Amino acid sequence: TRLSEILDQMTTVLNDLKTVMDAEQQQLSVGQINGSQLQRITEEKSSLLATLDYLEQQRRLEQNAQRSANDDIAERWQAITEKTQHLRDLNQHNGWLLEGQIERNQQALEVLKP
């Protein structure tokens, strides 16, 4: 009868896990209709970076164009390289956070293995 109790408790847990992990899939998915917060962040980030990359290429094309002294281009360029450096480190950190997510995912797998 205790073996019957254990199996009943497991089904309750397995049913609740199903709900939670369905929610996780939604969180990690992209392009969904009713999208998660992470999806919105993912899509906006990648579109913003596309713009930055485009603007960077345009900037490089402006190497020969003359100046309007006085113009704070060197000052504004300094602030830009600063912000990009900081975003670079943040992107590296977030990638490392993703690796942590992956590590827990694999830990989750070993529990679910028969």
Coordinates of N, CA and C in Angstrom, one line a residue:
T1 N 0.8 -1.2 0.0 CA 0.0 0.0 0.0 C 0.9 1.3 0.0
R2 N 2.1 1.2 0.5 CA 3.0 2.3 0.6 C 3.6 2.5 -0.8
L3 N 3.8 1.5 -1.6 CA 4.2 1.5 -2.9 C 3.1 2.2 -3.8
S4 N 1.9 2.0 -3.4 CA 0.7 2.7 -4.0 C 0.7 4.2 -3.6
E5 N 1.1 4.5 -2.4 CA 1.2 5.9 -2.0 C 2.3 6.7 -2.7
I6 N 3.5 6.0 -2.9 CA 4.6 6.6 -3.6 C 4.3 6.9 -5.0
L7 N 3.7 6.0 -5.8 CA 3.3 6.2 -7.2 C 2.3 7.3 -7.3
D8 N 1.4 7.5 -6.4 CA 0.4 8.5 -6.4 C 1.1 9.9 -6.2
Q9 N 2.1 10.0 -5.3 CA 2.8 11.2 -5.1 C 3.7 11.6 -6.3
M10 N 4.2 10.6 -6.9 CA 5.1 10.8 -8.1 C 4.3 11.4 -9.3
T11 N 3.1 10.9 -9.5 CA 2.2 11.4 -10.6 C 1.9 12.8 -10.4
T12 N 1.6 13.2 -9.1 CA 1.3 14.6 -8.8 C 2.5 15.4 -9.1
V13 N 3.7 15.0 -8.7 CA 4.9 15.7 -9.0 C 5.2 15.8 -10.5
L14 N 5.0 14.7 -11.2 CA 5.2 14.6 -12.6 C 4.3 15.5 -13.4
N15 N 3.0 15.6 -12.9 CA 2.0 16.5 -13.5 C 2.4 18.0 -13.3
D16 N 2.9 18.3 -12.1 CA 3.3 19.7 -11.8 C 4.6 20.1 -12.5
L17 N 5.5 19.1 -12.7 CA 6.7 19.3 -13.5 C 6.4 19.7 -14.9
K18 N 5.4 19.0 -15.4 CA 4.9 19.2 -16.8 C 4.5 20.6 -17.0
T19 N 3.7 21.1 -16.1 CA 3.3 22.5 -16.1 C 4.4 23.5 -16.1
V20 N 5.3 23.3 -15.1 CA 6.5 24.2 -14.9 C 7.4 24.2 -16.1
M21 N 7.7 23.0 -16.7 CA 8.6 22.9 -17.8 C 8.0 23.4 -19.1
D22 N 6.6 23.3 -19.2 CA 5.9 23.9 -20.4 C 6.1 25.4 -20.3
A23 N 6.1 26.0 -19.1 CA 6.3 27.4 -18.9 C 7.7 27.8 -19.2
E24 N 8.7 27.0 -18.9 CA 10.1 27.2 -19.2 C 10.3 27.3 -20.7
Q25 N 9.7 26.3 -21.4 CA 9.8 26.3 -22.9 C 9.3 27.6 -23.5
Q26 N 8.2 28.2 -23.0 CA 7.7 29.4 -23.4 C 8.7 30.6 -23.1
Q27 N 9.3 30.5 -22.0 CA 10.3 31.5 -21.6 C 11.5 31.5 -22.6
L28 N 11.9 30.3 -23.0 CA 13.1 30.2 -23.8 C 12.8 30.2 -25.3
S29 N 11.6 30.3 -25.7 CA 11.2 30.3 -27.1 C 11.2 31.7 -27.7
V30 N 11.3 31.8 -29.0 CA 11.3 33.1 -29.7 C 10.3 33.1 -30.8
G31 N 9.7 34.2 -31.1 CA 8.8 34.3 -32.2 C 7.4 33.8 -31.9
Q32 N 7.1 33.5 -30.6 CA 5.8 33.1 -30.2 C 4.8 34.2 -30.2
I33 N 3.5 33.9 -30.3 CA 2.5 34.9 -30.3 C 2.4 35.6 -29.0
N34 N 2.1 34.9 -27.9 CA 2.1 35.4 -26.6 C 3.4 35.2 -26.0
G35 N 4.4 36.0 -26.3 CA 5.8 35.8 -26.0 C 6.1 36.2 -24.6
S36 N 7.2 35.6 -24.1 CA 7.7 35.8 -22.7 C 8.5 37.1 -22.7
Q37 N 8.9 37.5 -21.5 CA 9.7 38.7 -21.3 C 11.1 38.5 -22.0
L38 N 11.6 37.3 -21.9 CA 12.9 37.0 -22.4 C 12.9 37.1 -24.0
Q39 N 11.8 36.7 -24.6 CA 11.6 36.7 -26.0 C 11.7 38.2 -26.5
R40 N 10.9 39.1 -25.8 CA 10.9 40.5 -26.2 C 12.3 41.1 -26.1
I41 N 13.0 40.7 -25.0 CA 14.3 41.2 -24.8 C 15.3 40.7 -25.9
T42 N 15.2 39.4 -26.2 CA 16.0 38.8 -27.2 C 15.8 39.4 -28.6
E43 N 14.6 39.7 -29.0 CA 14.3 40.2 -30.3 C 14.7 41.7 -30.4
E44 N 14.5 42.4 -29.3 CA 14.8 43.9 -29.3 C 16.4 44.0 -29.3
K45 N 17.0 43.2 -28.5 CA 18.5 43.2 -28.5 C 19.1 43.0 -29.8
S46 N 18.7 41.9 -30.5 CA 19.2 41.5 -31.8 C 19.0 42.5 -32.9
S47 N 17.8 43.2 -32.8 CA 17.5 44.3 -33.8 C 18.3 45.5 -33.5
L48 N 18.5 45.9 -32.2 CA 19.3 47.0 -31.9 C 20.8 46.8 -32.3
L49 N 21.2 45.6 -32.2 CA 22.6 45.2 -32.5 C 22.8 45.3 -34.0
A50 N 21.8 44.9 -34.8 CA 21.8 45.0 -36.2 C 21.9 46.5 -36.7
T51 N 21.2 47.4 -36.0 CA 21.3 48.8 -36.3 C 22.7 49.3 -35.9
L52 N 23.3 48.9 -34.8 CA 24.6 49.4 -34.4 C 25.7 48.9 -35.4
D53 N 25.5 47.7 -35.8 CA 26.5 47.1 -36.8 C 26.4 47.9 -38.1
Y54 N 25.2 48.2 -38.5 CA 25.0 49.0 -39.8 C 25.6 50.4 -39.6
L55 N 25.3 51.1 -38.5 CA 25.9 52.4 -38.2 C 27.4 52.4 -38.1
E56 N 28.0 51.3 -37.6 CA 29.4 51.2 -37.5 C 30.0 51.1 -38.9
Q57 N 29.4 50.4 -39.8 CA 29.9 50.3 -41.2 C 29.8 51.6 -41.9
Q58 N 28.8 52.4 -41.6 CA 28.6 53.7 -42.2 C 29.6 54.7 -41.7
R59 N 29.9 54.5 -40.4 CA 31.0 55.4 -39.7 C 32.3 55.2 -40.4
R60 N 32.7 53.9 -40.7 CA 33.9 53.6 -41.3 C 34.0 54.2 -42.7
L61 N 32.8 54.3 -43.4 CA 32.8 54.9 -44.7 C 33.0 56.4 -44.7
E62 N 32.9 57.0 -43.5 CA 33.1 58.4 -43.3 C 34.5 58.9 -42.9
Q63 N 35.5 58.0 -43.2 CA 36.9 58.3 -42.8 C 37.5 59.5 -43.5
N64 N 37.1 59.7 -44.8 CA 37.7 60.7 -45.6 C 36.9 62.0 -45.5
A65 N 35.7 62.0 -45.0 CA 34.9 63.2 -45.0 C 35.5 64.3 -44.0
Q66 N 35.4 65.5 -44.4 CA 36.1 66.6 -43.6 C 35.3 66.9 -42.3
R67 N 36.0 67.7 -41.5 CA 35.5 68.1 -40.2 C 34.9 69.5 -40.1
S68 N 34.1 69.7 -39.0 CA 33.6 71.1 -38.8 C 34.1 71.6 -37.4
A69 N 35.4 72.0 -37.4 CA 36.0 72.5 -36.1 C 35.3 73.8 -35.7
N70 N 34.9 73.8 -34.4 CA 35.1 72.7 -33.4 C 34.0 71.7 -33.4
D71 N 34.3 70.4 -33.5 CA 33.3 69.4 -33.3 C 33.8 68.3 -32.3
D72 N 32.9 68.0 -31.4 CA 33.2 67.0 -30.3 C 33.2 65.6 -30.8
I73 N 33.7 65.3 -31.9 CA 33.7 63.9 -32.5 C 34.6 63.0 -31.6
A74 N 35.8 63.5 -31.3 CA 36.8 62.7 -30.5 C 36.2 62.4 -29.1
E75 N 35.5 63.4 -28.6 CA 34.9 63.3 -27.3 C 33.7 62.3 -27.3
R76 N 32.9 62.4 -28.4 CA 31.8 61.5 -28.5 C 32.2 60.1 -28.9
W77 N 33.3 60.0 -29.6 CA 33.8 58.6 -29.9 C 34.4 57.9 -28.7
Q78 N 35.0 58.7 -27.8 CA 35.5 58.1 -26.5 C 34.3 57.5 -25.7
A79 N 33.2 58.3 -25.6 CA 32.0 57.8 -24.9 C 31.5 56.6 -25.5
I80 N 31.5 56.5 -26.9 CA 31.0 55.3 -27.6 C 31.8 54.1 -27.3
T81 N 33.2 54.2 -27.4 CA 34.0 53.0 -27.2 C 33.9 52.6 -25.7
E82 N 33.7 53.5 -24.8 CA 33.4 53.1 -23.4 C 32.1 52.3 -23.3
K83 N 31.0 52.8 -23.8 CA 29.8 52.1 -23.7 C 29.8 50.7 -24.4
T84 N 30.5 50.6 -25.5 CA 30.6 49.3 -26.3 C 31.5 48.3 -25.5
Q85 N 32.5 48.8 -24.8 CA 33.4 48.0 -24.0 C 32.6 47.4 -22.9
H86 N 31.7 48.2 -22.2 CA 30.9 47.8 -21.1 C 29.8 46.7 -21.6
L87 N 29.2 47.0 -22.8 CA 28.3 46.1 -23.3 C 28.9 44.7 -23.7
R88 N 30.2 44.8 -24.1 CA 30.9 43.6 -24.5 C 31.1 42.7 -23.2
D89 N 31.5 43.3 -22.1 CA 31.6 42.6 -20.9 C 30.3 42.0 -20.4
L90 N 29.2 42.8 -20.5 CA 27.9 42.3 -20.1 C 27.4 41.2 -21.0
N91 N 27.7 41.2 -22.3 CA 27.3 40.1 -23.2 C 28.1 38.8 -22.8
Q92 N 29.3 39.0 -22.4 CA 30.2 37.9 -22.0 C 29.6 37.2 -20.7
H93 N 29.2 38.1 -19.8 CA 28.6 37.7 -18.5 C 27.3 36.9 -18.8
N94 N 26.4 37.5 -19.6 CA 25.1 36.9 -20.0 C 25.3 35.5 -20.7
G95 N 26.4 35.4 -21.5 CA 26.7 34.2 -22.1 C 27.1 33.1 -21.1
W96 N 27.8 33.6 -20.1 CA 28.2 32.7 -19.0 C 27.0 32.3 -18.1
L97 N 26.0 33.2 -18.0 CA 24.8 32.9 -17.3 C 24.0 31.9 -18.1
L98 N 24.0 31.9 -19.4 CA 23.4 30.9 -20.3 C 24.0 29.6 -20.1
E99 N 25.3 29.5 -19.9 CA 26.0 28.3 -19.7 C 25.6 27.7 -18.3
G100 N 25.3 28.5 -17.4 CA 24.7 28.1 -16.1 C 23.4 27.5 -16.3
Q101 N 22.5 28.1 -17.1 CA 21.2 27.6 -17.5 C 21.4 26.2 -18.1
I102 N 22.3 26.0 -19.0 CA 22.6 24.8 -19.6 C 23.0 23.7 -18.6
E103 N 23.9 24.1 -17.7 CA 24.4 23.2 -16.7 C 23.2 22.6 -15.8
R104 N 22.3 23.5 -15.4 CA 21.2 23.0 -14.6 C 20.2 22.1 -15.5
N105 N 20.1 22.4 -16.7 CA 19.3 21.7 -17.7 C 19.8 20.2 -17.7
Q106 N 21.1 20.1 -17.8 CA 21.7 18.7 -17.8 C 21.6 18.0 -16.5
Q107 N 21.7 18.8 -15.4 CA 21.4 18.2 -14.1 C 20.0 17.7 -14.0
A108 N 19.1 18.5 -14.6 CA 17.7 18.1 -14.6 C 17.4 16.8 -15.4
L109 N 18.3 16.6 -16.4 CA 18.2 15.5 -17.3 C 18.5 14.2 -16.5
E110 N 19.5 14.2 -15.7 CA 20.0 13.0 -15.0 C 19.0 12.6 -14.0
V111 N 18.2 13.5 -13.5 CA 17.1 13.1 -12.6 C 16.0 12.4 -13.3
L112 N 15.7 12.8 -14.5 CA 14.6 12.3 -15.3 C 15.0 11.1 -16.1
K113 N 16.2 10.7 -16.1 CA 16.6 9.4 -16.8 C 16.1 8.2 -16.0
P114 N 15.7 7.2 -16.7 CA 15.1 6.0 -16.0 C 16.1 5.2 -15.2

